[PDB]
């Protein structure tokens, strides 16, 4: 029971944290020459490491050593808070945590491949979409600056048909008779080119704006679907961890 305690794993610093990763406040487990064992507790997305020292029979954190075992010391603190030991540890040891029962061994191993294939298929779908997202962010903001540039282009052209109206209609009254229909037709020709060109430009900006909404539309749909893939991708990953624990080289075939 000392070794067959559910929460006693006996593992390196790294694979503790990967087992503590993404669990809630209060979750725990227990773990070289510095002391003996280590209570690695999780608190609000951060791992607190608490040393267990063993000397003349007793086990404990520091001075109040009157606990005759490793399995003794944890049962007390699963009920009670750690604040009285060290002031700012107002959190209990609440989640002392450590799938088909396919006692078949080989059939658990096959399921590990099925889930790991699904997971891997899932991770690509997520990666595909993340890149579509980030492209689409770029393609949108280029669409936006294009609209600005369009709008600034138009201002320059609107200004142009204004700029000519000053000087072109200064020329009508300053002469009129000399090149009446001759000079004014060929000034009218320019003006009607200039305004139809503004008309083409405005129609070009418009046509981009309708594409921008359809882009911004697709962008939402990508995000939507990312957010629906994400929680599946966790639970699929989390089942794969539990199957791979329950088993434990040969594996690398199933993965």
């Amino acid at each position: 029971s000392l070794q067959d305690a559910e929460w006693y794993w006996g593992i390196s610093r790294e694979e503790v944290n990967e087992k503590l990763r993404d669990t809630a406040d209060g979750t725990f487990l227990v773990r070289k020459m510095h002391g003996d064992y280590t209570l690695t507790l999780r608190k609000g997305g951060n791992n607190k490491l608490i040393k267990i020292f063993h000397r003349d029979g007793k086990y404990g954190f520091s001075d109040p050593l009157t606990f005759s075992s490793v399995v003794e010391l944890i049962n007390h603190y699963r009920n009670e808070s750690l604040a009285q030991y060290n002031p700012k540890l107002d959190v209990k040891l609440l989640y002392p945590v450590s799938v088909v029962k396919e006692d078949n061994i080989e059939a658990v191993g096959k399921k590990l491949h099925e889930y790991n294939t699904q997971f891997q298929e899932k991770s690509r779908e997520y990666d595909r979409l993340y890149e579509e997202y980030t492209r689409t962010s770029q393609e949108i903001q280029m669409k936006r600056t294009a609209i600005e540039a369009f709008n600034e282009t138009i201002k320059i052209f609107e200004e142009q048909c204004q700029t000519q109206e000053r000087y072109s209609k200064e020329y009508i009254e300053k002469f009129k008779r000399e090149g009446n229909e001759k000079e004014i037709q060929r000034i009218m020709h320019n003006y009607d080119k200039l305004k139809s060109r503004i008309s083409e430009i405005i129609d070009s900006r418009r046509r981009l704006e309708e594409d921008l909404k359809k882009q911004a539309a697709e962008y939402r749909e990508i995000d939507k679907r990312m957010n629906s893939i994400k929680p599946d991708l966790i639970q699929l990953r989390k089942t794969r961890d539990q199957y791979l624990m329950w088993l434990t080289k040969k594996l690398n075939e199933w993965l």
Binding site: K32, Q141, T145, N227, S228
Partner: protein, 1042 residues
Amino acid sequence: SYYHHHHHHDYDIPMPPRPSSGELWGIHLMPPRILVECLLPNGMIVTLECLREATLITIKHELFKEARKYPLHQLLQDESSYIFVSVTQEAEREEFFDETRRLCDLRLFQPFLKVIEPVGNREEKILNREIGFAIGMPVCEFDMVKDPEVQDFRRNILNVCKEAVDLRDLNSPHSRAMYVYPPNVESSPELPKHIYNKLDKGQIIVVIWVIVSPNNDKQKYTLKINHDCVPEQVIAEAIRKKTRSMLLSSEQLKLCVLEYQGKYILKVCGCDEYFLEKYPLSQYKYIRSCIMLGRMPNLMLMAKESLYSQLPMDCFTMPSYSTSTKSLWVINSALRIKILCATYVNVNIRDIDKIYVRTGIYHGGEPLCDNVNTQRVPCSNPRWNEWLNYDIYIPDLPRAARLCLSICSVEEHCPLAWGNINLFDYTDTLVSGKMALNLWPVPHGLEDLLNPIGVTGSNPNKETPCLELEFDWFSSVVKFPDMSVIEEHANWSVSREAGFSYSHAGLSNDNELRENDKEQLKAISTRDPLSEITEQEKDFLWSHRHYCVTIPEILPKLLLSVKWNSRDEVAQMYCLVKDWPPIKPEQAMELLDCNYPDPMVRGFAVRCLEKYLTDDKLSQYLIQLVQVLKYEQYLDNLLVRFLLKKALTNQRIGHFFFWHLKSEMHNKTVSQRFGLLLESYCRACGMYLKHLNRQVEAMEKLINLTDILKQEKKDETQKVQMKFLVEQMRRPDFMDALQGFLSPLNPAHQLGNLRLEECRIMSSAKRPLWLNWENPDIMSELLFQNNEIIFKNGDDLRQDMLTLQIIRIMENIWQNQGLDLRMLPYGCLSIGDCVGLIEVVRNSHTIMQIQCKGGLKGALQFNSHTLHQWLKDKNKGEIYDAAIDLFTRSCAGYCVATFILGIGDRHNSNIMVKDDGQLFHIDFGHFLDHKKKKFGYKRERVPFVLTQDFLIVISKGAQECTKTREFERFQEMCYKAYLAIRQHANLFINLFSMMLGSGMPELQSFDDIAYIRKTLALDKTEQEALEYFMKQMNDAHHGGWT
């Protein structure tokens, strides 16, 4: 029978290029002949048909001929009284001053020009365009930023610029020369044993070259001097030999030597490198290379005035852009924050039950219990109007406190978006009122609910989850206390501790401390930053903080022991850090990673650098120092001011500083910050801007060219693509843009004319360009006549860049500890979003190529000996013995590095060998076993598994190579190397920690970096780690290692 007749009804049978354009909107390459509308001052639109490649000089000159044919000509002035303006692809109205610029290089939006008389009479000043070309955004886009922090950054940074410009023009022209051509020098003058044994009782033969007339003939003066003798001494002996004569006495010689001596300086023949200060010749990098490679130095005597002729005047010019309040410690409440509404949450209502907002106060680690709000109105129009209540009193909020939040889904816990926000602003002001916070999407790696490493501030992208919220109001702007005030609170708390009872000091906290404890601290100090400290150790370290000043290097550990939610403790820590002994830069750099956000701590870190970090050592670690800018809270800070001044002080750093910032300009988490910094540099760097603008223009051309190949000239034979390539490189604008410039891989290398006959597209699907330039140096021949580099649009180069940097550093550690393992960290440089330059190593081939070319007609199996045969063919005689030594030494280094780093699996097409016998790896892929993310599970893989081929070469042709002295020697290199890197394992952890900022999927959190702990066996003893490494190496090879 194959698939149990199971139909997949779903299945229908019906390089990564990102989408950036150039030349003209929506079109990579403008048509060779194009119509451009010219808008005249008289309101007429004459349309010209212009050549794509035509200068504005030409287009103006033709416009004013063709204007005459249209009405109202007599209202036009002479053509000289006018300038072209148009709307560019960045949506700004750019006046085209440099009329030698070509139509295809203006980055127009639509093909049209407008004729105006030039406003902003200071034309000088509206060559800001230069700056914003270099940067990749217009300078005017900053001027219209509301944010006072930004506008304050721009105004206040000029201090640094003005000061640096003053250091340049101090002993001018020498100091200008010294800025532009700083000496390329190793850190240590002490020469490793193995280098000192290659030369002749401490002496080198050197070759000094000289010119008289008409610059065609040149003259050797083969010296033989002591290695440690300075450039001046070497200039004398050259001039002695040069001017000894039968018609000159001895006396008359010495007098002619003094008049000539200091008129000259020493150049490296073949590249722009010089020896302009008193260091041993051995300490310059060129020399020490020449020693190692078995080469005779070719320097040049250069007239100082011909050098100072080529320097230009900087002409720095200041740009146009030139109280009583409540102490935080008066505020008598707990912290509360009101979460209001989130507007843009994109969620399937069928998939999602409901969502809430997670929050936490942070310091990189959390100052209180994390807390959430109720799950309200789930996915549809989520609004909560809750005050979240945080158990921390306002006065205990530390200077670098941050609120980190996320919108989550429901144990179905899962994050949708996230954002962080500094509880104090840049003016020390506690944040009060309402805030809009546009959120970031959850990245690849992070599954966690919150993201405190992530960048502080709101996502600049509008169309994203905007979660708006409200911070309390204490009828006053609250400010953070002065240091004077914090110092008194500390002096108070100290004496207050002295009077506490002995009874009470029996919880977690004498004048003389135990000898067992005095030695437990020094053991803690030696641990790597990833060996997490326990709550007992924290309390322990804290309690002996005053002894900890005796062990300066403990500081990183001490700081994580402080309770940052107790202003009592922090205020005292502030007084320790005030005058804690400086520590080595390799250790101080840890304190600029994300774990240490406090301003006083980071200031101390910068104070360490300011003392110790040499310009050599800075430019080695420049990548990490630029990245670390991400974790600074505000724009103006000490680190930025340190780095900026160095960049403006030393043009070699300044170069790589520009490119590393410029590189990341697409990444919207840093664009504004880096853009702002880039502006400062560009404004103050001097003539180098004009040089950088040419590098910058060359790369934009390569980007557009490869963009076309990758997108429109696919499904076309190599033959067809290669024709298109060559065709385009012959156009005048490409000739212009791609010929007269400095290589970004090393600006000492000038790139001259293109040799298009040697330029090609490589076989890869990414369509890399292999490019070749004539080295236009006078002594090209003495170094290399051609200079060739690979431009690759497609792959993200920065993983490789990091790997190569790590390799560069491993070598230096090894070598400078006297043990000769020869790595080849070829040059890699990202300059963009998945765009880069790779240095070509000539005379090297992949193993695969070596195996073909020596493979018999009948393909019955490739011979293990052909590598060895190929190597013998290249190295005959006594040359052979050292070619195997090289291969054995290089193969051992790359074995250890590779294993420690956990790189992509090696095989015949990513392993390369040089004619001289040097082995080196390329294309590393993913660097900390990132494909273990799929399964991994503690793989601890050997990526370089020496097949027979390699072993045969190592043990010169013997059968059963496993059992030779050749291979015993090899193993003892590998064991000695592995241990050497293991003793510098702090450094490598910190280098990887500093790269968490960058958006590299391989580096998302500190447990990505945890691989390097396993592979270096840091938890174990060194003896066990030797045995661990052996075990690892034995099992991968199946025998050999005990």
